[PDB]
Amino acid sequence: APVTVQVAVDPPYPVVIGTGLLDELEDLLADRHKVAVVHQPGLAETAEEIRKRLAGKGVDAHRIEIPDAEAGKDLPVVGFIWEVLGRIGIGRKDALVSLGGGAATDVAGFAAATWLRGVSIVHLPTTLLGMVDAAVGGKTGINTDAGKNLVGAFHQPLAVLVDLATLQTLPRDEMICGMAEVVKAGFIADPVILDLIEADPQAALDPAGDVLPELIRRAITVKAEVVAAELREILNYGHTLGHAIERRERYRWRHGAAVSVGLVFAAELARLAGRLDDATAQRHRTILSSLGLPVSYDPDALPQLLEIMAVLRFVVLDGLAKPGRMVGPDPGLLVTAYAGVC
Amino acid sequence: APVTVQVAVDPPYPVVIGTGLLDELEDLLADRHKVAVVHQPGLAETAEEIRKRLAGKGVDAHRIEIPDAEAGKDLPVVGFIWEVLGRIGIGRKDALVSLGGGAATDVAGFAAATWLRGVSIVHLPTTLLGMVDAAVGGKTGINTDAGKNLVGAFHQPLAVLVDLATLQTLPRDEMICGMAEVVKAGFIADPVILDLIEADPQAALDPAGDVLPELIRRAITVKAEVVAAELREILNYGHTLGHAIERRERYRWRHGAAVSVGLVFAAELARLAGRLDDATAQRHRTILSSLGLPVSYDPDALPQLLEIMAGVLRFVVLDGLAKPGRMVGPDPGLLVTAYAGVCA
Numbered sequence A: 001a002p003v004t005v006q007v008a009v010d011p012p013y014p015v016v017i018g019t020g021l022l023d024e025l026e027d028l029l030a031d032r033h034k035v036a037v038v039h040q041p042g043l044a045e046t047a048e049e050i051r052k053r054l055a056g057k058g059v060d061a062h063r064i065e066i067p068d069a070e071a072g073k074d075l076p077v078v079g080f081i082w083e084v085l086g087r088i089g090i091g092r093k094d095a096l097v098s099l100g101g102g103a104a105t106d107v108a109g110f111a112a113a114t115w116l117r118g119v120s121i122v123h124l125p126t127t128l129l130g131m132v133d134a135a136v137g138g139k140t141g142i143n144t145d146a147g148k149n150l151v152g153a154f155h156q157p158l159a160v161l162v163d164l165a166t167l168q169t170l171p172r173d174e175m176i177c178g179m180a181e182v183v184k185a186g187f188i189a190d191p192v193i194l195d196l197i198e199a200d201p202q203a204a205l206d207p208a209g210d211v212l213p214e215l216i217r218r219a220i221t222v223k224a225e226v227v228a229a230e231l232r233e234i235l236n237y238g239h240t241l242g243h244a245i246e247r248r249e250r251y252r253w254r255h256g257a258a259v260s261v262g263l264v265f266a267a268e269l270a271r272l273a274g275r276l277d278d279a280t281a282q283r284h285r286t287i288l289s290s291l292g293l294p295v296s297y298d299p300d301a302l303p304q305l306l307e308i309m310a311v312l313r314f315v316v317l318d319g320l321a322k323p324g325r326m327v328g329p330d331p332g333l334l335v336t337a338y339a340g341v342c
Numbered sequence B: 001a002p003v004t005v006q007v008a009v010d011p012p013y014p015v016v017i018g019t020g021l022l023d024e025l026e027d028l029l030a031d032r033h034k035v036a037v038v039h040q041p042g043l044a045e046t047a048e049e050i051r052k053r054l055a056g057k058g059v060d061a062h063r064i065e066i067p068d069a070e071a072g073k074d075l076p077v078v079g080f081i082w083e084v085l086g087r088i089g090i091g092r093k094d095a096l097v098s099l100g101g102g103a104a105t106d107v108a109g110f111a112a113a114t115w116l117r118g119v120s121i122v123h124l125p126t127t128l129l130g131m132v133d134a135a136v137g138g139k140t141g142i143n144t145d146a147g148k149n150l151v152g153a154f155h156q157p158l159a160v161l162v163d164l165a166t167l168q169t170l171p172r173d174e175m176i177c178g179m180a181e182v183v184k185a186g187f188i189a190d191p192v193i194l195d196l197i198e199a200d201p202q203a204a205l206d207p208a209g210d211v212l213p214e215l216i217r218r219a220i221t222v223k224a225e226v227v228a229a230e231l232r233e234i235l236n237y238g239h240t241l242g243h244a245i246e247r248r249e250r251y252r253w254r255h256g257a258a259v260s261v262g263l264v265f266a267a268e269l270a271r272l273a274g275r276l277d278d279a280t281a282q283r284h285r286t287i288l289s290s291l292g293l294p295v296s297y298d299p300d301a302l303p304q305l306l307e308i309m310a311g312v313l314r315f316v317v318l319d320g321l322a323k324p325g326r327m328v329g330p331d332p333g334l335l336v337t338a339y340a341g342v343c344a
């Protein structure tokens, strides 16, 4: 029943996709003398059940609770984890387990990376974003005095367990958040993602349907191909304007909403440049709006956004699933593209 | 004229050992858009020469002075470095350089390993200990609330530059501190090291002579060969009791003087166990003491020492010169006895 995607890295590691993955989690960490589970506030009950079940197999399983969301990622939360790993006596051969969204995976991933020079971690992402993006591929990031995610270590996890059952509690808004990243994968590597969504957009958003599991298999396949690959740049499709919008709105905008405007922008850029056909360009706008994602932003915001973007690089499409670059485009071309969008 | 020891790891890097290595640094880093040189207070004039010659090559070169010694390794110093990297605009393809003793290489190592997911770093160690131990291997450590060196990343450097000219200003007491690691390497892997020291122990301690550069090369070879391969444990020979003595002394003992007592303890422990010949056992104390290192500790400290070592004991022991083995969960009475052989 459970599908797996191997990431072809040294050593290779699996992303496992299915429903109720406790058995698989047991198989992996049964031999570990100790295990700590870093979870967001809302998942304490799911944490306890991992701990109970691990404790059951003769394992000193512990659990640690971090602040939700972006606060679970500040440097003092990392300090906090460190101390606790200290008191528990977590050693070189033991393991961490992350339970939550991208923020939980980042911070736990960072702590694992920097504890005794790196200890095993299994990610159990529980947002769609965390599932298709944050948990896959070994980049970690934390929030420090320096900014957001400038600090972070590179550390691949032992495995990633993508348990579709966990999505049943996830709200519409966060589901739509992460779909923006999924659409991005559709345009840059796998157009079947696009056809699956197109066929019924509301069914794409239902965690209980046939469509979502396949969307996640595919978006994760795309990300695993990239990280086993500089091409890692393609995953920034839509993030140049995206991130600027996120900044300008002081992080109130859901990441995915900002990426969504970015994609529609990137598409207009490549269209005006004669690199992308009108039909594929227009398809950005129609897929994203129909999922409830934003396709426009304040038409007066461009000057402030150009300032934040501090020459510029964009990922553009040179045709469906053929990403290229545009480096230092003319400001007036950025103006014109912005108009068309906004 | 420089010697290169290759560290055969992936990706592999060289350790280059010679005199005046500024040209080698330039070859390495000339093509980088930005370099930041993280250095201890006393090396500021040397930091500036580096920064200067790198700027003459179009590199946007910066220098960052950290607090000296352990204070330089504290979490806050880390937050500061990150801040400066952010301010300077150090990117994914840029590079750090570390200049100083093992404390500089660690803190600057941790910083490179945790900046934008790991960027290039070149180590310029300027103590014996830093040259032979700290700079080689990719382990970094920093001091936090959790204790010393529990927190750290694993990150290989681009290269290691071991410039003997820098040892000219190093005091005897630091030099002797580093030599305990050199001696450790002799006992576990390369006996020629011991032969060279015993031939004239004072020649061994002179940065001007011809002996020290060979001891440095061989000690680094030993460590490179171990890291390129649960063998890593032999590098802790003498560190099991030694680390406890250090920690009991709230770190007012030098690391080398603690390791020296630990080597003599492990020698005696393997001797009483029948694993090590009397002559090789006693050779520990003779080489260490001839170099000016302590050879015993406080006769009443064992119980506290065991309580620090707890926080089943394992020891690296020698089954013969350069044949390291293990002792797992020794009889408590065997430890009482080895220690009393060491301490009166």
Ligand SMILES: NC(=O)c1ccc[n+]([C@@H]2O[C@H](COP(=O)([O-])OP(=O)(O)OC[C@H]3O[C@@H](n4cnc5c(N)ncnc54)[C@H](O)[C@@H]3O)[C@@H](O)[C@H]2O)c1
Binding pocket: A040, A041, A042, A068, A069, A070, A073, A100, A101, A102, A103, A104, A106, A126, A127, A129, A130, A133, A134, A135, A137, A138, A139, A140, A141, A149, A166, A167, A168, A169, A170, A171, A174, A177
């Ligand atoms: N390292 C990387 O490669 C990478 C990639 C992309 C994003 N990220 C990071 O991910 C973070 C954002 O990720 P996110 O969108 O998951 O944010 P998040 O982890 O902040 O989660 C959003 C919210 O959903 C809640 N939640 C999580 N799982 C739930 C569930 N199953 N049911 C109900 N609610 C649930 C959380 O408590 C949180 O309030 C950002 O900090 C970003 O930098 C990292």
Ligand SMILES: NC(=O)c1ccc[n+]([C@@H]2O[C@H](COP(=O)([O-])OP(=O)(O)OC[C@H]3O[C@@H](n4cnc5c(N)ncnc54)[C@H](O)[C@@H]3O)[C@@H](O)[C@H]2O)c1
Binding pocket: B040, B041, B042, B068, B069, B070, B073, B100, B101, B102, B103, B104, B106, B126, B127, B129, B130, B133, B134, B135, B137, B139, B140, B141, B149, B166, B167, B168, B169, B170, B171, B174, B177
């Ligand atoms: N990462 C590792 O594998 C590893 C291995 C061994 C030691 N270490 C770390 O190394 C640190 C100790 O290293 P250390 O002994 O170099 O201590 P250190 O870096 O504190 O330096 C000792 C002193 O010598 C001064 N000094 C440095 N170079 C000099 C020179 N060329 N001339 C004159 N003075 C000089 C320094 O400013 C400092 O006061 C410890 O923090 C230890 O944990 C790390």
